[PDB]
Design goal:
EF-G; four-stranded antiparallel beta sheet; 1 chains; 8 strands; binds magnesium ion; RNA-binding; alpha+beta; fusidic acid; Ribosomal Protein S5, domain 2; antibiotic; ribosome; 30S ribosomal protein S5
RNA sequence: AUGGAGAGUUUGAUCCUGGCUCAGGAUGAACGCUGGCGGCGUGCCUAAUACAUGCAAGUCGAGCGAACGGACGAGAAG
């Protein structure tokens, strides 16, 4: 499992004297073979925050249906104000994505896709929107089984 | 299918909303520094402001009369 630190953020809680600072780490973990997850970790130092985030991400993983390195179909993943449009591309296109979306897609193993963040650019909600889209993706075989037909009947 | 990336900035910290700003491409460009060559293009966007000077619409003698011109070659011998 490869892991990428998306963002590290120094948050503060106010106390009677001064402030208590902590580090929050958002991390994406993936095998580059259709499995991806994300996690957050809070600690007094960034290495420990990253370690906790990685453990949480490994706890939470999703399976991404793929077709030769790209998604089966266009999808818009939404979470809160996050919103990420994603569209299958052709080989050699590359991953046309910005910010946390690229982390999520590359670690999921997608190498050719087009995307656009249409909503909030706050990294955690961007990641959640991307994961929501990948979760709602569908594959031809599963939809054929659900609709009680064959792939050939599906495509006519 | 030939095709679509985002970032900074409101808070002690947060999410949202929201504007501002930046990274790209372009030009009949101008300016600053600098500047070797070749090829192909482009070059008063302003004052439809005023313009010295030269040139940018002539040609036809196989339409016509006239004028100039004077070969080829006549005559006298100074
Ligand atoms: Mg949680």
């Amino acid at each position: 499992f490869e892991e990428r630190v998306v963002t590290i953020n120094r948050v503060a809680k106010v106390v009677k004297g001064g402030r208590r600072f902590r580090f929050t780490a958002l991390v994406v973990v993936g095998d580059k073979n259709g499995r991806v997850g994300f996690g957050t970790g809070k600690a007094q130092e960034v290495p420990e925050a990253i370690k906790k985030a990685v453990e949480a991400a490994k706890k939470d993983l999703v399976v991404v249906p793929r077709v030769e390195g790209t998604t089966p179909h266009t999808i818009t993943g939404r979470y809160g104000s996050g919103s990420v449009f994603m569209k299958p591309a052709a080989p050699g296109t590359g991953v046309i994505a910005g910010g946390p979306v690229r982390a999520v897609l590359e670690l999921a193993g997608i190498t050719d896709i087009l995307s656009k963040s249409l909503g909030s650019n706050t990294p955690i909600n961007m990641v959640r929107a991307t994961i929501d889209g990948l979760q709602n993706l569908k594959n031809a075989e599963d939809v054929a089984k659900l609709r009680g037909k064959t792939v050939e009947e599906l495509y006519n």
